[PDB]
């Protein structure tokens, strides 16, 4: 079974230490923490196809790429970057990220399928490491 899914969050790891470090202020960070404690993520996958829809209230991501193919997202704190995803295995990729303007972290996603059926999304901004776990339903 590949990455297609709706996957729902069972485990999370220094969420609020990310957005820190990429700048974002308490109150900010108390919204997005609340709006993370629930995320709907559904991912279709065709191959190297992918969909990914990230949505909470107050703030949704939709990306559509091709693994190896760069394309325009934004950052975990909202801000414009260039994206390339890369496979690991048939079971990890690697996004690595530049930012469109300013100044900042250097950020990184991963997102891996596991053999127990997780899906394992690290978020890095330098040196923080950010670890959400999610299965199926
Ligand atoms: C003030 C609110 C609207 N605001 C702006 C600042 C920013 C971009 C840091 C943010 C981020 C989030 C947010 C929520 C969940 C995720 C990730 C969820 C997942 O992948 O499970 C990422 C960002 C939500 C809300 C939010």
Same mark, same amino acid.
């Given at each position: 079974?590949?990455?297609? /899914?709706?996957?729902?969050?069972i485990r999370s790891e220094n969420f609020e230490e990310l957005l820190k470090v990429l700048g974002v202020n308490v109150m900010l960070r108390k919204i997005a923490v609340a709006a993370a404690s629930k995320?709907?993520?559904?991912?279709?996958? %065709? /191959?190297?196809?992918?969909?990914?829809?990230?949505?909470?209230?107050? $703030?949704?991501?939709?990306?559509?790429?091709? @693994? /190896?193919?760069?394309?325009?997202?934004?950052?975990?704190?909202? $801000?414009?970057?260039?994206? &390339?995803?890369?496979?690991?295995? %048939?079971?990890? *990729?690697?996004? %690595?990220?530049?930012? &469109?303007? /300013? %100044?900042?972290?250097?950020?990184?996603?991963?997102?891996? &399928?596991?053999?127990?059926?997780? &899906?394992?999304?690290? *978020?890095?901004?330098?040196?923080?490491?950010?670890? $959400?776990?999610? @299965? $199926?339903?």
């Amino acid at each position: 079974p590949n990455f297609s /899914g709706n996957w729902k969050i069972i485990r999370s790891e220094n969420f609020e230490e990310l957005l820190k470090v990429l700048g974002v202020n308490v109150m900010l960070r108390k919204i997005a923490v609340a709006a993370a404690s629930k995320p709907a993520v559904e991912i279709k996958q %065709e /191959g190297d196809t992918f969909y990914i829809k990230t949505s909470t209230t107050v $703030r949704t991501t939709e990306i559509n790429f091709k @693994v /190896g193919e760069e394309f325009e997202e934004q950052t975990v704190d909202g $801000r414009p970057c260039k994206s &390339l995803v890369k496979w690991e295995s %048939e079971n990890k *990729m690697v996004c %690595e990220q530049k930012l &469109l303007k /300013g %100044e900042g972290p250097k950020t990184s996603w991963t997102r891996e &399928l596991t053999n127990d059926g997780e &899906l394992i999304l690290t *978020m890095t901004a330098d040196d923080v490491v950010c670890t $959400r776990v999610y @299965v $199926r339903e």
